[PDB]
């Protein structure tokens, strides 16, 4: 009985493969060949942030594009005034094993998580003056790889139990758990319209969810190893992943397949962080060989390199206004590039 | 010229001072990654040592020991084992009453790229009742290729040698020890290994070693 429908499942997989093959009448490489190259982009470290003491693992920008978030092994979640290199807050963590952080789009709340299996949400704009913890979201059975705010009252967390979930911060319950990943989810990014998101697990597959229906809409499986980072294209109709095989791949939602692969023969180290630019022409990827690369997302050429970190870069993200990109590394240093 | 909001800079400097004080306070603590098989005596060894992820902390001879039982994560080890880099030692413990799962885990954690230069404190826990097992079920049952005397001492030595044979880097040490669940001495062994590691790190920082 199991094989009777396993054959049907294999037939369905072959059918979707044939459909995607038929839909690929061309490729991005031979369509964007007439576009002039973006050239060589040289970025200089405008500001460096030297507050942390051990292994910054995560980072998130504010919506105002001036305030950062920084989560390190030191057990501190210090948010920076990036313009003046000031520390406007210093949140001590209950557990120093932090793997992710997020800044709410309104700027009121900052989240955190890690090996403690709990997404603890910290209220910044408190009447008491200090930064208390508002809610401790529990229910996951794996390390929290990533977490992002839909708004002040909804957060979606990607955990290490091969599931992602959508939480109600006011009540603290799992409003809608997402399942379908065979391996543990390691990354997560939300669409600009916020109606849907994607997640990349260690099964070398990135799936398209939707926060309202709760089902899985499409699956992209072009990689070969564990996926460590995902980011949408700015228009929300494509996204770029990053895995341990040192290749970043750009999948497009409409054609449901893979458009381009950003791989070079001189790099054999996996990507830890990926983010686009404001226009979407660039593609900033943070590699394990201590340095970041910027990729011409429409031509796959290495536009430039962002070196200056003495250890593996673990986080990377451009601001909403696209003015600068921040890279955090295991050297406990943050740098702002322009 | 800063405005009257240079109090923001003052607050930033106060935050930096608090961060530096907290960092120098935390550096004085010793971090141990406790590791092993399921029901291998980790709970027993922590309970005898005076007290998701669970951290056990105790003080012995003016050292603050922090033991992290990372056995509570039933996920892919490689995706979070890089968190426990830069620990002083790995207090790996096995159950002699068992086994090849322990050998596989030891091989995985001894040659890991992050833990190449990290010392391992190996505990052959529960060696009091291993005599009962070896008196009725010889080590040939657990190790088919083992040939030789079936005495308690020789069997324990063979198991210890098998565990130490999974070590390849000559720059790391494996302080093997036997617990027999009586304990009251594992703290001393961990303290001596941590003292060796601390002295080696101090020599490394000064360029001597």
């Amino acid at each position, epitope marked *: 009985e199991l094989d009777q429908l396993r054959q049907e499942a294999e037939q369905l997989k072959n059918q979707i493969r044939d459909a995607r093959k038929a839909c690929a009448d061309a490729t991005l490489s031979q369509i964007t060949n007439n576009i002039d190259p973006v050239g060589r982009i040289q970025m200089r470290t405008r500001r460096t942030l030297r507050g942390h003491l051990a292994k910054i693992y995560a980072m998130h920008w504010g919506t105002d594009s*001036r*305030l950062l978030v920084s989560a390190s092994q030191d057990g501190k979640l210090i948010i920076w*005034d990036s313009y*003046t290199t*000031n520390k*406007v*807050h210093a949140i001590p963590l209950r557990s120093s094993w932090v793997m992710t952080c997020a800044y709410a789009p309104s*700027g009121n709340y900052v989240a955190c998580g890690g090996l403690d299996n709990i997404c603890s949400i910290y209220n910044l*704009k408190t*009447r*008491e*003056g*200090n930064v208390r913890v508002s809610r401790e979201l529990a229910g996951h059975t794996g390390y929290l790889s990533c977490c992002r705010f839909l708004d002040d009252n909804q957060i979606v967390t990607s955990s290490g139990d091969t599931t992602c979930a959508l939480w109600d911060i006011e009540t603290g319950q799992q409003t809608t758990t997402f399942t379908g990943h065979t391996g543990d989810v390691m990354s997560l990014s939300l669409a600009p319209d916020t109606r849907l998101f994607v997640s990349g697990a260690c099964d070398a597959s990135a799936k398209l969810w939707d926060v309202r229906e709760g089902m899985c809409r499409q699956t992209f499986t072009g990689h070969e190893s564990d996926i460590n980072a995902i980011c949408f294209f700015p228009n929300g109709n494509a996204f770029a992943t990053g895995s341990d095989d040192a290749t970043c791949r750009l999948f497009d939602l409409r054609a449901d397949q893979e458009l381009m692969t950003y791989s070079h023969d001189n790099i054999i180290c996996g990507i830890t962080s990926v983010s686009f630019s404001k226009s979407g022409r660039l593609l900033l990827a943070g590699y394990d060989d201590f340095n970041c690369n910027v990729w011409d997302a429409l031509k796959a050429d290495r536009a430039g390199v962002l070196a200056g970190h003495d250890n593996r870069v673990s986080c990377l993200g451009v601001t909403d206004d696209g003015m600068a990109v921040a890279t955090g590394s295991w050297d406990s240093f943050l740098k702002i590039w322009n | *010229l800063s*405005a*009257e*909001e240079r*109090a*923001a800079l*003052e*607050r930033s400097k*106060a935050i930096e001072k608090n961060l530096k004080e907290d960092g120098i306070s935390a550096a004085k603590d010793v971090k141990l990654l406790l590791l092993g098989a399921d029901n291998s005596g980790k709970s027993t060894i922590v309970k005898q040592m005076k007290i998701g992820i669970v951290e056990t902390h105790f003080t012995f001879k003016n050292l603050h020991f922090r033991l992290f039982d990372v056995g509570g994560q039933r996920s892919e080890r490689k995706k979070w084992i890089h968190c426990f880099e830069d620990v002083t030692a790995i207090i790996f413990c096995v159950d002699l009453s068992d086994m090849h799962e322990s050998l596989m885990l030891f091989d995985s954690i001894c040659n890991n790229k992050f833990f190449i230069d990290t010392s391992i404190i190996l505990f052959l826990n529960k060696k009091d009742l291993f005599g009962e097992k070896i008196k009725k079920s010889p080590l040939t049952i657990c190790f088919p290729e083992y040939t030789g005397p079936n005495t308690y001492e020789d069997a324990a030595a063979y198991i210890q040698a098998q565990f130490e044979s999974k070590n390849r880097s000559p720059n790391k040490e494996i302080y093997c020890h036997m617990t027999c669940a009586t304990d009251t001495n594992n703290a001393q062994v961990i303290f001596d290994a941590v003292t060796d590691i601390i002295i080696a790190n101090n020599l490394r920082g000064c360029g001597l070693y």
Partner: single-chain antibody
Amino acid sequence: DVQLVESGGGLVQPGGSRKLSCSASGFAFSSFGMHWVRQAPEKGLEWVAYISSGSGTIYYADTVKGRFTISRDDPKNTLFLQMTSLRSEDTAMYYCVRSIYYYGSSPFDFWGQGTTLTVSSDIVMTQATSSVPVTPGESVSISCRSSKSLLHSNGNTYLYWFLQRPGQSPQLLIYRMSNLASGVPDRFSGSGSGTAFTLTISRLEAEDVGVYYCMQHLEYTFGAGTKLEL
């Protein structure tokens, strides 16, 4: 909740000395930089002293420098203003005013109840209208100018609007000329350009009756105040 209570008021012969205590409870008193302002029985607010978080920086007004001193005890959560050589110009009510300074913060958010202490190159701001009659349901505008432009080089203009209802402590309404204080109704709105500033209230309510004070925070001053009468 947040609550600052002051003690130390009373009758003093001129030239003596007295200390005013500000017992603060309900908030992280250590990280806040508490101020101290005073208001004469028939006049407006007048800043007196200021001690930061950790007592690392302290400032005084010209008319009070030397005679007074400000001290904070974080473990006991009290603020002290030791006053020496009191004169008849110090007859006022002293308010213990909260303030926390960081990017996006709202200084002067909370104000103490006050203690009536009675005894037997500076930016000056002017509010032209001493008092303007108003009616409920209408829209009224209150404007004050400054001698020196309050717009710093970082794009922030440092103007704070305070409202003092009859017999009540002043409340922060607008900080930095455009940002509403937490809890203030959205009726109030701020505007201005460098030197000339204006505050507009849409659909005035009967509870908004009071004197409005605008203060500059560019450097180490209030205005006369425009009393609104229904």
